[PDB]
Every structure is written in structure tokens, then in C-alpha cells.
Amino acid sequence: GVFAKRTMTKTRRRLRDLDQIERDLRSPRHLQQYKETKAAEDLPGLGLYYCIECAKWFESETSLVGHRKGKPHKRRLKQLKEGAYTHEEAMAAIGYRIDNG
Amino acid sequence: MRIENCFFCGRPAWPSKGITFMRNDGKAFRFCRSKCHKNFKMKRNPRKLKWTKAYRKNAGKEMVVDSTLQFAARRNVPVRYNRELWQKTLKAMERISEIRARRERVFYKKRMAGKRAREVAAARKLVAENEHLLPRLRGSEKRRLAELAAERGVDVEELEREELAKLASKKKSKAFGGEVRRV
Amino acid sequence: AIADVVAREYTIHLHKRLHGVTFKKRAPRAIKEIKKFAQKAMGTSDVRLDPQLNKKVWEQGIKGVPFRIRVRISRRRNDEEGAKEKLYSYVQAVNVKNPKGLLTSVVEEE
Amino acid sequence: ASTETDLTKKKITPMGGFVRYGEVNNDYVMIKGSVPGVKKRIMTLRKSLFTHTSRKALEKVELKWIDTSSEFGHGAFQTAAEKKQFMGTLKKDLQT
């Protein structure tokens, strides 16, 4: 079940992208950038319980360990194993390259 | 001006076509149409959507390793303008397009080689299972061809195969129902 | 040049005739446009449809009319006494492999 | 429909023709913006009654590209050759 499914495609209801999640996993600086764009006092569990793969905060360690056994987290893990779509793959799909000399 | 490519499906994006999504990390995503834009907003994977160049490249249905595809690139180092260089470049693009098209046709034929053998095997299996559905003579036609062959001293097999050729040439369909005669 | 008694097989594109029609009227409207097609094709105001053709039209409910149908229209003499019309059309459904890709064809008398 | 910077030899008619009009096989006038009529409608073109007062009337127009893609949808190809070059070889191409 999705909360307010009528307007889930609106820009103000947008969630984090999979390539951004890959860069967050690969680089802690990118994850730090994303976390400084938020306020720690408004986050669930004071921001201390965060799943990077789901890009989502939780109220407790019990809730985080709980969602890890669920299928949305496993769906995110399978999508990350497959690899997110990027501009490099978009260029390689049409046979386009960058010539820097 | 120039020709962009759609991020989602790889189709050519001409000016005033589609829409661009500007992300707060600093990435621009150009979409040729609202179909690609709405699939992106629904977070569908172009590599999984079968109508995309990304899927076709992943599945190996596009010619990707070829010498004619190494001529087009994003040139980040500009070259001073030279009229003869641009004219010979135009001639190069025309010849490269012809060569790439004919190599792509060869690639598609190498992809689609085995169809004839598969179809022949399926046809043999279907014929062996349904020999009784092949066209044949009617009983009255057999009777009249036998009596004509007896009268004219000709080959009943010859008249049978001639009538088979005529019935193969003349194809007629069947209509459902039929009119009820009024009293 | 063409005699009064002649039968031809046509393909009727009912999709463009039923485009935008109310769902509860699509099959009766399809029957009416089949009658109109037969009248325009053969010049006969008296058109009689086969019950098997009616079943073929109504096969998928009141709003499931096929896009194309293969029919045979036969113009015959009406021999009943005191007849307003000397000719009439009888329209039947034709058993074909697939109704697309077929031309209008004269049915042989034999 | 070809310009000095677009060397594609093509006519003004879009791919698949103008929607609900057909093809333009005669002389044509390109007018900036919109005009009061609809498709197929007769139009009267008239000289301006007064001498112009704007720099826009004295400007020289330099076209770089003219769209000739299909207006029957989201047309992404200016020419049928471009469409076949992007698509590749189809099943009906070998079937023919």
C-alpha cells in the first residue's frame, strides 16, 4: 500500500534516485551532502537509524532490522546488484563516446 | 544547434522536443517525449523496458562493436575552422552512413539465420500430424474422373492431378447459415 | 453489364463506423451499418441478415463488435406476389482464416 | 526546407504529411506566429497599409533548421532515411 497514490508522481512527492543511492554507497561525502540537506531534529529516530539502500530513515534499530527482512529492501538490493541506469550507459546504448584528446 | 539523444530511449531529440529534468546534484536529463518522461517519473528501468535502445544494447540486438561507430563523439577539444576539412567531413559522414547501414543488415541476418531450419522442422511435424487435412478429391469428382478416363482411355491419376491443380488454383470460402424460404 | 443476381464478398471496417458510439448501442448500431453497407453496395433497400451473422456481431457482448468482418452479400430476385421491391440482399458471415488483407471478390455462381 | 547550416535535402511537408491537409507541392509562405484561419481554409494576404515603425520589420531572417518531423505524434525523425537508419533492419525487410 502506498500513501496517497493519486499524487505520488508529483515533483513534491519525489524520492531519491538509484544512481544517487549508488553514489551514496560508494562515497561517504555524497551521503554527507544529502544528510546536510536535511534537519536532524525532524528525522525519525533523530536521524540515527538510516538505510542507505532504501534511502530512508527509521525510528529505531528494531524497525531497521525489521525492514531489512522485507521484500522492498530486497528489491532495492536486487536493483543495486543489477546496477542503476546512468548517462554513461545511455551513451553506450547508442554508441556515443566523449573525446577529451 | 545540434541533435541530442533521449536519456531514456535514445531516440534523437531535436529542438523544442520533449522536456529536461534538472536535478539538485547538477545533472540534466533530456527526454524526447512525455512517455519517456513519465516512465522516468515512475522510476522504470530503460534496460528492462524492451522498446529502449538501452534494452537492445543489453540484449545484444544492436551492432555495438564496429569500426564505423568510432567516428562520432562529443568533441571537447575544438578545431579551428577549415572549409576543406568540413567538406571532406561531410563526404566522410555520407560514406560512413552507407557502410554502417550495410554492415547492420549483415548483423541482422547473422542474428536471424536459424529461422528457416526451425520453420522447416515445425512444418514437417505439423504435416506428419495432420496428413488427413490435405486437399483431396470429392467422391463424385473421383467417380466422374474415373468414368471420363474409362471413356477416353486416359490416366485416372493424370485427370486427378489436373483436377487437384484446378482446385488448388480456385480457392473458395464457406459462408455460415443460409436463407430460410418464406411460405 | 452486371446481372440482377450477383453475389460478392466484402470486408466491412466496422471500427471506423462504431468509433465513439455509446456502449449500450454499439451492436445494434453495427447491425444498422451492416444494413446500410449492403443497401449502398447493392442498391437494394430490402436487406436480410443471417442469424449466424447476428451471432457473429453479438459474439462478444453489446460492446465487443469486431473491427473487421468478412461478409457475403447476395442480390436475389424477390418472387413473392405484390412485391414493392423486385430485388433484395441477403448478407451472411463468411468463414475465413483472418478477415484482414482481403479484397472484394465476386462469388462464382457454380 | 533546407537551410545553409542544415544540408538535408528535404521538402516542407512533415513525415506522413500535414495532418488533415495533405502535402504542399506548390510555392509556400512561412509566416512567423499564428494566423486567424484553420487548415484547408482560404487566406487573404495583404500589404501593410502603412510604412512600418519597428526594427523587426527591417530585420533580416536567417533560418538554421526547419522541423519536418511527423505532427501525427511525437515524431523524432526528419526523414524516412533517418528513421530507417535509427531503427535498423526490420523483420519485414527480410520478409520482402
Added chain:
Amino acid sequence: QALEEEEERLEKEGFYDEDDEEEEEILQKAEYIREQHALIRNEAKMRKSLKNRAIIPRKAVKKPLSQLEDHLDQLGVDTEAIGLRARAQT
């Protein structure tokens, strides 16, 4: 020039070259069989309305002699040599 030399090379080892009556006959026979199958399926779909009502049993409907002779003639059986007129009731 490298692309050209590769092109006449591929012409030299024939990268672009292009290549049975019994096979064609068996495909035509299979196509005829598929058409017959489609006609049989269309006949069944015409005569079946099992969603709304049951099909009347065949033993409750008496068959026409003309239809039986036409079907046996199409199947290839001489009706005069077996005499269906005597078997048909009145």
C-alpha cells in the same frame, strides 16, 4: 583510408555475400493445415455459446441427408456406393 581498406578486405573474404522445392512444398502444406485449423476453430466459436446456455445434444437433432452427403463427399466418400438414401428416414 583505414575504413576503406577494411571494406575491400571484408569484400575479399566475402563478409557481405548472400546465399529447396521439397521444403517450399512442406511449408505450403503446413500453411494449408494451419488455415484448416483456423476454419475449424471459427466453426467451433460460431456454434458454441457455453457461457449462457448449453449446446443441444446431437442425438436430439435429426441431421439432413443433403448435409451428410455433402460432408462425406468433401471428406472423399462415395455416397452412391453406400446408399444413404435407404438409410435416411422420412
Added chain:
RNA sequence: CGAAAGGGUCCUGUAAGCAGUAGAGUAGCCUUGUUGUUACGAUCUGCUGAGGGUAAGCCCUCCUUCGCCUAGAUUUC
């Protein structure tokens, strides 16, 4: 001119069926495991940007077919 058809242009997203040392696992027969083997089994892969639709207010077709035609009625300084 009309009805079909063909080609184009768009829309969707890869048809039915067949096959597969793809498929988590389970159960049989024996070489008792050495893709042991056979069976079933969401799904996946190939045939297949395939199948389906396309004017109903899309385009083209003296040159792809079939049909129609110089009417009828009424009125008019």
C-alpha cells in the same frame, strides 16, 4: 465518387506456439550420482521493436482490386 487493399506516419510494448546443459526446489527410476536420468515448476532467454491498432475530423496510390454515373421530384421576371 465509394468500399476494400497496399505503402507511409503515429500508438502500445515483444503476440500465439515451440524450444532451451536457464530456473529456487521437490518427487520417482536406475549407472546411486559423476549437468546421474526423468517428471513438475512462478519466472527467464530465442524465434520477436514482434503481435495488435491506425480516421472514425491522418497522408499517398490515372499506374492494387471491386462497384457506381449524363438521375428522380419540385419551383422559377
